[PDB]
Design a protein around this ligand. Structure first.
Ligand SMILES: [Cl-]
Ligand code: NA
Ligand code: NA
Length: 129
C-alpha cells in the first residue's frame, strides 16, 4: 500500500506514535517519507547482508526474522514479511521497541540526516487529525 501523507499521519496517531518518547508526529511521518516513500512494500538490502523492510525500513539484523540474516536477532518477534502489510500495526509496535532502545530516533539514518533539526510539523500541515 502507498499511503497518503495525511492518511499515514492518522494511522500513526491512532496507534499512539504522536509524542511517543517525546517525538512528535511529524518526526515519524518525515522518517517514513525518506525511508520508504510511504510504501509498505519497500525493501532495501544493506551492505552487511541484512535487509530493511516496510514503511519504517526496520532491519532484519536485530528486529525481525527473514530466514537469511546469519546470526541476527528477532527482538520484535515477527517475520520480516509482517512489516510489509497494508496494516502498519506490526511496524508501529516494533518501532516503539526500537525508539526506546537508547538512541531514540537516531536509529533511523534518514531521520538523523533529513528530519532531525528541521521543521517536522510541516509533515502534518493541513491534515485533519
Ligand atoms: Cl530521545
Ligand atoms: Na510534529
Ligand atoms: Na536469519
Amino acid at each position: 500500500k502507498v499511503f497518503g501523507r495525511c492518511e499515514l499521519a492518522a494511522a500513526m496517531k491512532r496507534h499512539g506514535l504522536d509524542n511517543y518518547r517525546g517525538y512528535s508526529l511529524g518526526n515519524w511521518v518525515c522518517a517514513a517519507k525518506f525511508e520508504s516513500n510511504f510504501n509498505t512494500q519497500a525493501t532495501n538490502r544493506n551492505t552487511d547482508g541484512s535487509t530493511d523492510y516496510g514503511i519504517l525500513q526496520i532491519n532484519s539484523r536485530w528486529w525481525c526474522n527473514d530466514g537469511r540474516t546469519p546470526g541476527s536477532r528477532n527482538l520484535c518477534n515477527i517475520p520480516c514479511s509482517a512489516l510489509l502489510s497494508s496494516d502498519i500495526t506490526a511496524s508501529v509496535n516494533c518501532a516503539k521497541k526500537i525508539v526506546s532502545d537508547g538512541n531514540g530516533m537516531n536509529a533511523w539514518v534518514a531521520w538523523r540526516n533529513r528530519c532531525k533539526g528541521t521543521d517536522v510539523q510541516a509533515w502534518i500541515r493541513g491534515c485533519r487529525l
